[PDB]
């Protein structure tokens, strides 16, 4: 099966880099054997292991950047929400609910009431 991301997430950047370099070495030797001999599908497992390691490394780096830009304006564009363009555009909940003071006074004075027609 190869490597497992839950085992890799306990490691550091350096261990992961060493792991990845070793995996690339192994992939190269497997490529040589693949042409010396008719078939070799371990290359699949080692390729996906490289993929999982790179995934974990990117994840660590990104969460570090997130904790660096934690709770301040102007986060990077690959880290804002993607939601969709038109939503990232026009108004927020605050700005949409903004209401002038005349209208606020009227709302408080004369809200819609609950009423019932029996008696």
């Amino acid at each position: 099966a190869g490597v497992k991301a839950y085992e890799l997430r306990t490691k550091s950047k350096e261990q992961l880099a060493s792991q990845l370099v070793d995996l690339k070495k192994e992939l190269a030797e497997l490529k040589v054997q693949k042409l010396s001999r008719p078939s070799l599908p371990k290359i699949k497992t080692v390729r996906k292991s490289i993929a999982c390691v790179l995934t974990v490394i990117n994840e660590q780096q990104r969460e570090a950047v997130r904790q660096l830009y934690k709770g301040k304006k102007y986060q990077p564009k690959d880290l804002r929400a993607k939601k969709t363009r038109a939503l990232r555009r026009a108004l927020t909940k605050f700005e949409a609910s903004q209401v002038t003071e005349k209208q606020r006074k009227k709302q408080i004075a004369f809200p819609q009431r609950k009423y019932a027609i029996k008696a």
Binding site: V65, Q75, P76
Partner: protein
């Protein structure tokens, strides 16, 4: 109450201050890793009988190579991985779309020893 003196009859843009970048946020979160490292530069040896003949005779290794790679990169990768000094690199693009590198090593190294160390022959 005084005036400037202008020897040319031409008015040009005053060279005002070119202020530098000082961003509040990075253009991208994480730097991309090296896109073309050694293991991406060399893919596979080429074990056709002609290539093995060139190994035995010309002290020449024959590699399959990334199309984004150049001779500088190929030399650097070979020296980095196989611990080998390098003369002339020749390159071609095959009729199948992959790049083929003919790497000639120096007289001190023996491409056949290097080849059986790499594993192929």
């Amino acid at each position: 109450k005084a005036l400037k003196v202008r020897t040319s009859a031409t008015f040009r843009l005053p060279k005002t201050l070119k202020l530098a970048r000082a961003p509040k946020y990075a253009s991208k979160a994480v730097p991309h890793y090296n896109r073309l490292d050694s293991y991406k530069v060399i893919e596979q040896p080429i074990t056709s009988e002609t290539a093995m003949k060139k190994v035995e005779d010309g002290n020449i290794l024959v590699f399959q190579v990334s199309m984004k790679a150049n001779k500088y990169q190929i030399k650097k990768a070979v020296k980095e991985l196989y611990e080998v000094d390098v003369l002339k690199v020749n390159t071609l693009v095959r009729p199948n779309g992959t790049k083929k590198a003919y790497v000639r090593l120096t007289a001190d190294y023996d491409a056949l020893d290097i080849a059986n160390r790499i594993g192929y022959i």
